[PDB]
Amino acid sequence: HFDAISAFENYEIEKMRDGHVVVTTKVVNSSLNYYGNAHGGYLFTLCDQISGLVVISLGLDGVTLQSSINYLKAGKLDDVLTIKGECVHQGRTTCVMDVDITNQEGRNVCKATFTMFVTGQ
Amino acid sequence: HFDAISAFENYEIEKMRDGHVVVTTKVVNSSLNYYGNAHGGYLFTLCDQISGLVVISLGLDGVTLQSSINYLKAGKLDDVLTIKGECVHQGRTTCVMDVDITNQEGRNVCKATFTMFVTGQ
Amino acid sequence: HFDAISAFENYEIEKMRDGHVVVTTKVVNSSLNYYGNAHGGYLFTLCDQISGLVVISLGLDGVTLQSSINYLKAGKLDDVLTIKGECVHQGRTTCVMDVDITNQEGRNVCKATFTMFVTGQ
Amino acid sequence: HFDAISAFENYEIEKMRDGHVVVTTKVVNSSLNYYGNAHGGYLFTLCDQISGLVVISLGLDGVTLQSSINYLKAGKLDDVLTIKGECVHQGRTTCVMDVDITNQEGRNVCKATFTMFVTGQ
Numbered sequence: 276h277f278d279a280i281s282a283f284e285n286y287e288i289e290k291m292r293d294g295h296v297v298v299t300t301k302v303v304n305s306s307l308n309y310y311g312n313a314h315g316g317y318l319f320t321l322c323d324q325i326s327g328l329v330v331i332s333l334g335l336d337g338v339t340l341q342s343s344i345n346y347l348k349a350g351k352l353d354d355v356l357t358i359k360g361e362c363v364h365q366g367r368t369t370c371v372m373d374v375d376i377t378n379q380e381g382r383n384v385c386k387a388t389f390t391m392f393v394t395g396q
Numbered sequence: 397h398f399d400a401i402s403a404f405e406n407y408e409i410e411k412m413r414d415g416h417v418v419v420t421t422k423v424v425n426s427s428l429n430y431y432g433n434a435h436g437g438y439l440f441t442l443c444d445q446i447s448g449l450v451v452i453s454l455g456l457d458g459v460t461l462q463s464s465i466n467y468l469k470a471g472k473l474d475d476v477l478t479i480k481g482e483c484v485h486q487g488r489t490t491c492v493m494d495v496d497i498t499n500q501e502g503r504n505v506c507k508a509t510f511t512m513f514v515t516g517q
Numbered sequence: 518h519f520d521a522i523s524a525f526e527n528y529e530i531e532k533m534r535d536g537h538v539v540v541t542t543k544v545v546n547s548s549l550n551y552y553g554n555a556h557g558g559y560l561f562t563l564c565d566q567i568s569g570l571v572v573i574s575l576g577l578d579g580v581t582l583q584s585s586i587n588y589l590k591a592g593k594l595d596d597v598l599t600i601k602g603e604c605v606h607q608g609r610t611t612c613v614m615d616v617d618i619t620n621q622e623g624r625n626v627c628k629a630t631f632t633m634f635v636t637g638q
Numbered sequence: 639h640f641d642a643i644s645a646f647e648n649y650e651i652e653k654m655r656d657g658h659v660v661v662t663t664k665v666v667n668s669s670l671n672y673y674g675n676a677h678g679g680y681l682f683t684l685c686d687q688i689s690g691l692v693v694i695s696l697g698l699d700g701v702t703l704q705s706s707i708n709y710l711k712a713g714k715l716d717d718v719l720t721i722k723g724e725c726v727h728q729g730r731t732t733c734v735m736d737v738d739i740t741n742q743e744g745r746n747v748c749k750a751t752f753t754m755f756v757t758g759q
Contacts, residue, residue: 281403520646
């Protein structure tokens with residue numbers, strides 16, 4: 276037995292300008308796994324939503340084909356995690372997005388790369 | 397503006413036997429993005445939780461170092477997604493887990509691979 | 518200083534049918550790193566080429582957008598490696614190819630997944 | 639039938655200091671695929687080796703557990719490729735290395751991320 280995992284119960288869009296996104300969010304009880312760290316799932320889901328926001332700030336609509344993430348340091352209750360997203364390559368129909376998460380201390384929680392297929396404009 | 401994404405509001409553990417896991421879950425409104433498909437985040441988070449369940453069914457405790465996922469077909473409201481997890485390699489301190497999601501039709505929604513660092517026994 | 522790294526000084530194509538490829542090869546010296554182990558780039562190239570072969574067997578042309586690979590066991594000088602690729606998803610615009618490497622002892626060397634951009638017929 | 643694929647017939651090591659590596663190289667013929675483009679396995683090997691160099695510059699030994707790579711622009715015969723690796727996370731048990739490839743035109747060829755298992759000092 277285990278309870279549901281949520282993401283984006285709180286958030287703030289600091290910035291969403293031309294394929295550059297920064298969002299801040301406080302870690303809450305919804306975010307943690309059985310060990311009381313931020314759930315990998317939860318952390319992915321932060322990075323993924325922000326990659327969708329990069330796509331949108333480019334004026335495009337899009338879908339993620341594939342993604343990779345590296346977990347570096349665990350997130351803890353009450354961290355202000357900040358989510359920094361940027362298009363590192365804009366092809367014709369596919370886009371590569373780099374998302375990084377750091378905290379209030381400036382340490383790095385995780386990194387992820389998104390390969391999107393652009394579906395419309 | 398956009399609302400929170402949840403995973404595992406409903407679930408059923410069909411099987412959790414020696415590094416083999418199968419969990420079923422119905423897609424709900426919590427699971428969908430602005431286009432009404434299952435959120436990549438949500439889908440990752442299903443695969444990731446089930447990889448944590450594989451680790452546990454091996455008698456280990458563990459942490460994910462890195463993960464990759466490929467999205468194949470979108471999930472829709474009211475799909476019974478089934479999540480099939482298996483340890484494809486057990487090293488000394490690291491484990492490789494393959495997770496697949498298929499639906500009620502048997503089509504494939506997504507695939508993911510987890511590289512875990514085993515933290516204890 | 519280090520010596521050049523090479524791939525496919527020898528091979529046998531056992532099968533090349535409708536998205537299925539089997540190809541074997543004998544690890545030799547230009548396959549190796551400074552530890553006398555089969556180079557990571559070398560096993561990756563074995564995998565990348567057989568994914569290119571899985572795609573040709575399907576009357577298609579394409580370029581790789583993304584690949585992930587996990588290293589399981591070392592290749593040793595003089596190993597016969599069995600390289601298996603199947604296209605696991607055939608999309609309109611993209612295909613995903615699962616490639617595995619086992620050795621002569623059936624032990625598992627290597628697994629990769631390529632995300633392809635289909636470009637020709 | 640196809641010809642053997644090769645990597646590092648030539649190179650210059652510009653820097654090799656404290657987790658930072660720069661290395662250049664001239665695309666030649668054994669670097670290429672059947673389309674006359676720099677082979678995916680070839681750019682991967684360039685990246686994999688420079689990650690191995692980033693790790694040596696840090697007084698460490700290690701083996702790769704996982705790598706992800708995105709292909710951005712083709713390498714063309716006769717390109718001078720600039721290969722940059724930095725260790726972006728130094729863990730107790732693992733390190734993550736970001737490697738990029740730009741060409742002589744500053745255009746971006748290639749990006750990869752290696753997840754390493756540290757084994758020696």
